[PDB]
Design a protein around this ligand. Structure first.
Ligand SMILES: Cc1cc(F)ccc1-c1c(Cc2ccc(/C=C/C(=O)O)cc2)c2ccc(O)cc2oc1=O
Ligand SMILES: Cc1cc(F)ccc1-c1c(Cc2ccc(/C=C/C(=O)O)cc2)c2ccc(O)cc2oc1=O
Lengths: 228, 210
């Protein structure tokens, strides 16, 4: 059978997102290594993205739009998640744990590094859970590009409300008061604005030294050819 | 800090800057007109910043950084608010209502226009209220240069304040959290616009604060 996204309970949404997680990939000149990693991560992101409840309900063209706006933020949230148990360090991959100082070997890279580090330490001191993380990553995929067919927008927003509900359930089951539930949610959603900022600074940097709409369309298209 | 939700709102409503006026247009004239308008609003913005509860308690360094980081986001949300009832147009001032065609007269400008219009169309579709608006505007000032325990206390207070307005208007407990989220996710898109806007402006405080 098939569960429509707007029918999911909070626990079924959490279970769907946890089950969709991509694996942690390994690293194979700093930049060449990072690009290869991202490239490989990308193929997996696509598989993940189609398992986000509500995503395949959209037109294909709308799917690519959302993925074109969100892809670098998604890479980044994952990076900051992996880096959480390693203060001062970015875990690009387990064989590629880089610190602030190595970052200074690439011009302008330290600033983004420091932004990424600060986001990671904020997640750490907030004690972000795995179950919250997956909610935030999905929110990113659905939200980044939604402000740039009226039924598609409404549907995307209704799925966003569902993940929000799911985040509130997690916080209520963790014992937070209503005030605390609202404040932590707000705090998590503001971190998302900073992740957007990081992404834009990241993109500026990449264009100055990248998946287009057309490649992501092709990669989305290619997914349908995968052997199950 | 000590204030109630009512007092916070009241304070925010009282601190609101005025709507300024602009002083047929060419490209260079339209941009001079927008520049001079924004220059004039920045003065009032600094003044409004100082009346935001919690802001002057920060160090002057933190006050300058937040404002330097957030000024365009603030200009932009004020614009999107003003333009809300004007489908397909940006109300930069009552005497400077500009349509999508008018923005095509400067290289790169129209892309930002569309993004501003979408934001504005989104606040209309949501029925953004004045009191919610002022809360969001203050969240932007406190959030945009944030990444310190004190900033986050004020933020939590504004969150609480937004929720109380929502409660006051009869929204269920689920509707409240849903709406709060929908609004703070708009803040992501406003940050993005600011970034795009800054990029374009490179393709060309200490006093009022101290
Ligand atoms: C650290 C950094 C600085 C930038 F300034 C731009 C991007 C990054 C960055 C990369 C590096 C990166 C390098 C190249 C590309 C290019 C992709 C492509 O060409 O398809 C993408 C990311 C990254 C790679 C893998 C990953 O899991 C997370 C990451 O998070 C980041 O913030
Ligand atoms: C529409 C736009 C496109 C850009 F690409 C950059 C900024 C804007 C923009 C401006 C125009 C603007 C033009 C010049 C300057 C400053 C120039 C300078 O200091 O030299 C600032 C704003 C603006 C002006 C007043 C206002 O209330 C809101 C506004 O919102 C915007 O998004």
């Amino acid at each position: 059978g098939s569960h429509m996204a707007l029918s999911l309970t909070a626990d079924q949404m959490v279970s769907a997102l946890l089950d969709a997680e991509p694996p942690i990939l390994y690293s194979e000149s700093m930049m060449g290594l990072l690009t290869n990693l991202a490239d490989r991560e990308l193929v997996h992101m696509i598989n993940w993205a189609k398992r986000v409840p509500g995503f395949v309900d959209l037109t294909l063209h709308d799917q690519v739009h959302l993925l074109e706006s969100a892809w670098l933020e998604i890479l980044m949230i994952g990076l900051v998640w992996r880096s959480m148990e390693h203060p001062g360090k970015l875990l690009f991959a387990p064989n590629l744990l880089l610190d602030r100082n190595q970052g200074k070997s690439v011009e302008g890279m330290v600033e983004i590094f420091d932004m990424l580090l600060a986001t990671s330490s904020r997640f750490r001191m907030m004690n972000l859970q795995g179950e919250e993380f997956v909610c935030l990553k999905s929110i990113i995929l659905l939200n980044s590009g939604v402000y740039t067919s009226l039924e598609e927008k409404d549907h995307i927003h209704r799925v966003l409300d569902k993940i929000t509900d799911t985040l509130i359930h997690l916080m209520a089951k963790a014992g937070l008061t209503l005030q605390q539930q609202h404040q932590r949610l707000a705090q998590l959603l503001l971190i998302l604005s900073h992740i957007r900022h990081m992404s834009n600074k990241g993109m500026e940097h990449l264009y100055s030294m990248v998946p287009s709409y057309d490649l992501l369309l092709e990669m989305l298209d290619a997914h349908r050819l995968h052997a199950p």
